[PDB]
């Protein structure tokens, strides 16, 4: 079951005869819900997904400024203006200046100068409103049947939760069913946030922070740009003229500020599906309807062999694969004990009742051994498998 | 001597044998200068004026507001925008308004609204930039020839002053010449100020105040009205509509604030001459080129008449008119005394040498009497006129 | 001269027995240098420049990665390796992915990952050396000719200065000579710095600061980027996959850091010719060889008047321009009194003997009346062009 492959693994044990076991899930992590007479259930949060956000704003982070014009008025001869001031994309600025006593000047002091330049956005990030009702939480659930790793990707049941389907049944063929309830409404605070997007790149950002950006922005339906000041500088006026510059691409600064946000991956297939990293959710599992498949079966009592020897795992837990050699739809007895006399089975099975359901069935088994050295033991009689182990 | 009629008058006496006599003149006041053997001279400031100043700004004080347009978007979706936001002559405001299923929304959040309206100035104050080198000055000057009042408007000399005309000559047909050194260009007491104008009314006001004035204003050459929010008001939005209103005419409030300023009149005839009701002049007068007419004339030998009896006038001086019936090309002996049997020339003539030109010519004579009880005497011998006077 | 219009100016004045008057020049300042028996001098600094300085570095701010590839090996199976790890144009990271049966490894544990991408630069910032032996200077000066406004077109002397020489001589026709000695080599601030250049913008940057940029950089005409780390990030490995990204264009952050460095402007008539800013040169000037052209001529004392009447100006002189209608070749006197008697004087002329060479032209002249009220007087005799002034 797929939790073997995840580094952060939590074992959660149900109290005997209890029904509802709570767990908390996070995308780097998985949980193996485990209960005393029922096969263990691996559960993990695969993704949080957001479908069809609405474009609220675009924020420009580089501007190709073009077609500057300037006009000027001599001291106490009036005040200057430009036709471009009547038009919203010209980003104009107005200021006094000194002016030359040789330049038709009347008197010492200040002339007046006005300049305008056609601001156009070269690159912008898009800010999307999160359609909070649309959020899907996608859960993987997989039962410890003892399926070999090749089969995990087909055996995993995938469940999608949103507020319309807060309860779901995972049904496992022959093992019964488990009911999941997940707290989709509580787990995230996307009400006060935008998805922020850049070329091939995306983030989820605080709605205040993204409004408070000192950058020129556009109303998402494509209107005027609204605060040109944050990208256009005018060099303090020369007596005859004033000269204008665009600031550089703020992309490097803007990504620097974004580093604290949760990253988002835009899907490969959908145009407008956004998958969100690091989101988490709480769930409860009704284990009660799960059952062991083969508690009816006879004990294998026949030659067995390891297809993969018991390896360690980071979980302090041993994983092995066993094939029953012949003639037996049967349950494989597994012990781990201090002595080859196997006085007491100190270790705990995670594959709570391992079964070879048919003569070819390659059975994965997971066992949590005691600390210290001990012997894992499989099968019975003259043909036991054994393997020395250490904590 | 038109400064008989002017209400505020200063006499000034030239130092005996000083070629230049100092004087100062004010917008509705007169100096009359006397020197011990020269005919007395009236000098008066007719106007301080500026011809064709440049308009710096127009300031809207009533606006009509038309073609209101609104765009509204539900709280889930993006920022609202209008085409009108790109046009300079639209006053426009952006705000967020409560919405819900009463308005066709999906969600109950704060929707977005923008509303723009076409702004047009109905009436505006014009601000004209003064420039002290452009100030014209005009001086009215007249000798005490003793002409009747009906002749004063032709005998008054008009002297015009500007940056070039730094000194001027007045020539009086029988009485020689004087020249004025009016330092008018520095005598002014205003700077960095606008002539402020409304229909048939005008003012002069501080530049910085008129820039601080909280009203929409326009560059003198035209173009966009650029602080429209000081006349356009938006009533807070209802869920799908916002009501935008122009404020009423501000001219009462505006000229209330102007009430403390010095007044100006646009000329009754000229296109662009503005006359300023203040300022003052400093001057000096070269009197030594004046000569008393006809002192070699014979004395009146025969009967005379008062035709306007001597009267007081507020300057503390006496004015009379006398007709010469016969023997006319003669000087009229004027004496003010206090011992009628043995008269002495105790009082001081302002009409320093009165002469008749032709039979039944009527002269005017102004005389400054001594303190106390006194006689004013005109003519000689038994047919002389005599009049009682006091203080 | 032309320096009247400069935003700020300073006064230095010598006395007889003194010589070698000290001065300081700055690239947009001016000084008036004066001496009692000799014409006043205006001085200013026109350009500091360097021609074709040497390449120090290029610093990249916009990496483009391509052709990434990866090698991965199971735990306890040695170290992964890539040929790209061993050649210059590939950035690489070597690290470990946690792996197990879920990822095709036979054992559970950390297996090594290495990944490399081809690195190319879309843009980079050049750093050029301050080749201080090549630091060109150009120095501007003029004497107080008295010439009217436009003649500044070609009257101004402007002088090349260089590390090749210490001093240069002014030649004034009719006004003698002067020597300016500049210590050109040593005044500069550029102890350890580079010309930093981006496309169409440039800066003078601290050498150590520039070397200490957290950015990939290349020596001269190199073939390798001597650091590559700072623009490449690797998202932590998942199974056998690791994915590599360029950071965004740092240009905006870099210009943000460069803000507050001294500007540079490249010229266009020659490539790689750089005008600096903030240039400095402390100098001394030998005034003793200067002379006045006209001191022996007679005073004008003829029909004369203002053509640009006196005004203040921002550095504290009074400036005026005047005409004699016709007269002799003569000197125009100006004197400043505190009474119209003009026999007692206190103000200073900076044009000491302005020259009316011929009748058809004006002279532009300057004066410094004392604190408080004062009279400017130009001409003498009957042409009493009196013009009052205050502070």
Residue numbers in the entry:
A (entry chain B), B (entry chain C), C (entry chain A): 1 to 391
Q: Any passages from the paper?
A:
Crystallographic studies have resolved the structure of the YFV E protein and shown that its domain architecture is similar to related flaviviruses, with three N-terminal ectodomains, known as domains I (DI), II (DII) and III (DIII) and a stem anchor region known as the transmembrane domain (TM). Here we use a chimeric virus platform to resolve the first high resolution cryo-EM structures of YFV. Stark differences in particle morphology and homogeneity are observed between vaccine and virulent strains of YFV, and these are found to have significant implications on antibody recognition and neutralisation.
Next, a cryo-EM map of bYFVES504/DIII17D was resolved to a resolution of 6.5 Å. This reconstruction displays the typical flavivirus architecture of 180 E proteins arranged in a herringbone-like pattern on the virion surface and is substantially better resolved than the bYFVES504 reconstruction. We then utilised the symmetry expanded local reconstruction method to resolve the ASU of bYFVES504/DIII17D to 3.3 Å. Similar to the bYFV17D:2C9 ASU reconstruction, M as well as the transmembrane domains of E have not been resolved. Exchange with DIII of YFV17D allowed for high resolution elucidation of the bYFVES504 virion structure in both unbound and 2C9 (E-DII mAb) bound forms, demonstrating high similarity to bYFV17D. Conversely, there was a significant increase in neutralisation of both bYFVES504/DIII17D and bYFVES504 T380R when compared with the parental bYFVES504.
